[PDB]
From a paper:
Immature retroviruses are built by the Gag polyprotein; Gag is then cut into domains, and the resulting CA capsid proteins form the mature capsid, which can mediate infection of a new cell. Murine leukemia virus (MLV), the prototypic member of the γ-retroviruses, is commonly used in comparative studies and as a basis for retroviral vector design. The CA domain and immediate downstream residues mediate protein interactions in the immature shell, and, following proteolytic cleavage, CA forms the mature viral capsid. In this study, we have determined the structure of the truncated MLV CA-CTD by X-ray crystallography and have resolved the architecture and CA lattice structures of immature and mature MLV particles by cryo-ET and subtomogram averaging.
Immature MLV particles were purified from the culture medium of HEK293T cells transfected with a proviral MLV plasmid containing a mutation in the viral PR gene. Subtomogram averaging was performed essentially : subtomograms were extracted at positions underneath the spherical viral membrane and were subjected to iterative alignment and averaging, resulting in a structure of the hexameric immature CA lattice at 6.6-Å resolution. The structure shows two distinct curved layers corresponding to CA-NTD and CA-CTD. The CA-NTD forms a hexamer in the immature lattice, at the center of which is a parallel helical bundle formed by helix 1, surrounding a central pore (black hexagon). Hexamers are packed together by a dimeric interface in which the C-terminal end of helix 7 (black arrowhead) interacts with the loop between helices 4 and 5 (red arrowhead). After fitting the CA-NTD and the truncated CA-CTD into the electron density map, there was clear density projecting toward the center of the particle that was not occupied by the domain structures. This density comprised six extended rod-like densities consistent with α-helices, running parallel to the sixfold axis ∼15 Å apart (black arrowhead). As this six-helix structure is positioned between the truncated CA-CTD and NC domains of Gag, it must consist of residues of the CAH that had been deleted in the CA-CTDΔCAH protein used for X-ray crystallography. In the CA-CTD, an additional density is seen for helix 310b in the subtomogram averaged structure (black arrowhead), indicating that the helix is present in the immature virus and is not an artifact of crystallization. The CA-CTD dimerization interface involves interaction between helices 9, as is the case for other immature retroviruses, but also seems to include an interaction between helix 310b and the base of helix 9 in the vicinity of W184 (Q192 in HIV-1; Fig. 3B, asterisk). Here, we show that, in immature MLV, the CAH at the C-terminal end of CA forms a similar helical bundle.
Author numbering:
A (entry chain A), B (entry chain A), C (entry chain A), D (entry chain B): 16 to 236
Write the structure that this text describes.
């Protein structure tokens, strides 16, 4: 029904604004509505701009795997899995159904990867600890940026040193300089670094603490 | 009607954003619409992402109880209560109806527990008293975090020392240091601690009080 | 129509968030739609959570009155007025209609009282005059909290000393200390107290007034 | 057989003395003997005193859940699940059998909760470290009291600060005073606290150590 298509469009941000929204909606519809190849063209054509759809389609074709489970750029294999022109898939046949299943899976992959927005290498670098922001709150914002703007899971054990380095570099300057000077820095987990940053953050100075220090200095000399 | 399903989706945050919203909507629908097992698959499939649904389904299976009222991980019992594949339940039979009742109850449990978001042990620690925030207002925010992000009821008598310790640790530093030094601290109720914190909060200094203190010091010397 | 029920739900906050919203909607519907007992179960079941509905139902049963106009906890009387299980009320009979009228009235009472949220004894105490807030503006916020979070009408003559005491206690500290010291304090109306607080609020000091005082002090010595 | 009933009674402590004993025996019998409602009355009537049985029965009725999986105090629902008077349950019917299953489950719940003995808030506070008792041995006794006399599992992550506070408060006075003074106390796990207490416990003084200190003081002056 065109009312469904337009409602989906109108109740969500554009793909470019926030890819997660439409991707999740389309992932759901791909299941509940079991769209054919033509139906998928209407979905994409209605919910995405020309430039977004193109990104998604190339990303979907890049997600095709050969029978050895590895990527393939062989035209015939790519075309057979994710055709750009109407295929002869017959939904009354197991053959047709299997192609439809795969097509939908690849379409989803395409959207997920096109959303990735080319490892937002700048959005992650732009997460800097605020002057009042606790180290744990800053770390959560930094992890959120990794999730949204990179393909790397900040909770993976293999990403720990990577997240740790961003955490040290992008902490407030006093904190970052002290974390950098920690003894056996290589041995510090992300949790260790947060605890060390908290010691600096919590055992610092405050306007009341500055008034107390000024009073103690005036009592001294 | 697909219009109902999509309306429910579009008028609520995602499950991940705020699990309470969709959980309450689904709890209601489970009653008013008396869904079958297939209907429940459409509900879940339409309102949740693939990753959310999975969490919910495993949480629902973890909520199954044996005839002795205790948890069970026995495949046959788990499968019989909360099947992952279409069951042969016939709604025209008391047997079918009872399974449907239980299934819906477990589905709800699954959502409630999946929402729990693994005892947000960080969200509770992140509630810190603001510099202008009264102790009672801070305590209410702290209790709200316990409710939303842990399975513990902050109003339970058995949670009092737990909430008390968070209250002391996460109060503004001047207040927390004084609460920690209270005589017979073990004997203080949560209400006592709030009253003691209020004494510090209210009998402190203000910019007008600082101007008065500076005037009194200038009158002194 | 399920569209009406779901529209009512989706266009309002939850009962817990703001009880007034749904209570007013349901009060209206109880009149325009003249619901039967089953209809009321759908209303409640759809618009309230399990925990909210329970609160409302117990509150409704607590609102039942005997023939002497007084509360009654006599099971038969409570059950007859507000049955928890489907009653045999026949809307084609004056008997059935009268029970329906009473049921709807009690349902409304239940919601009104369940909303009361147990005399939010903390929300009223949490209304504190802001540093720039006029005494009359503060008093209006304090009265709003009485209305929303207690069963007491702050405009009732019998509540005047009660509101007066909250007004004095929760005024800005300089104001509250002076109001407390007023001669013949017992004789002061709420209006008197507001006028006395205004004298303190308006005849105080300002940054321009502080600059003028500093200039006068520098001219003095 | 009355011999079984009296043997069970005579080979166990009373419910009041140690609820776990009879509860475990009855849980077993409820399974192996598949008792009817009347059989359960004989079990309870024979193994419990009048006052114990009453506690158990009210606790069992308090454990009844509605179809939404939540507690219910609706007379008809409570009565239907756990009747105080002989029900018409026919064990030759699936309907009768299901009620029997539920009844037995609720009976067990009732006993488990009646045993709880109202969160023995005093038994837990009464666990104090002995003068020769190691911190780990004391902690195990403290956890045992939580298990026996509260509904809280001392091994739950959400109970850690609660157990930690009891551990600090009820440690031997020298130990408790030092644990209270630990830097970053909020950051200490239960395991950390035990290790810190062990440092105090093991690096203290002994009668031989006192003789050595007296000899060193006599050598000094």
């Amino acid at each position: 029904s065109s009312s469904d298509l337009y409602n989906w469009k109108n109740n969500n941000p554009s793909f470019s604004e926030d890819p997660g929204k439409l991707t999740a909606l389309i992932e759901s519809v791909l299941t509940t509505h079991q769209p054919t190849w033509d139906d998928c063209q209407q979905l994409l054509g209605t919910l995405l701009t020309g430039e977004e759809k193109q990104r998604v389609l190339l990303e979907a074709r890049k997600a095709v795997r050969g029978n050895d489970g590895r990527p393939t750029q062989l035209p015939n294999e790519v075309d057979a899995a994710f055709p750009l022109e109407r295929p002869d898939w017959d939904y009354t046949t197991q053959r047709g159904r299997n192609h439809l299943v795969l097509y939908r899976q690849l379409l989803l992959a395409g959207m997920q990867n096109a959303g990735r927005s080319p490892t937002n290498l700048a959005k992650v670098k732009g997460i800097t600890q605020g002057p009042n922001e606790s180290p744990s709150a800053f770390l959560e914002r930094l992890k959120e940026a990794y999730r949204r703007y990179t393909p790397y899971d900040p909770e993976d054990p293999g990403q720990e040193t990577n997240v740790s380095m961003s955490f040290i570099w992008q902490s407030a300057p006093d904190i970052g300089r002290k974390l950098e000077r920690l003894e056996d820095l290589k041995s510090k987990t992300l949790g260790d670094l947060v605890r060390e940053a908290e010691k600096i953050f919590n055992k610092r100075e405050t306007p009341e603490e500055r008034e107390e220090r000024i009073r103690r200095e005036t009592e001294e000399k």
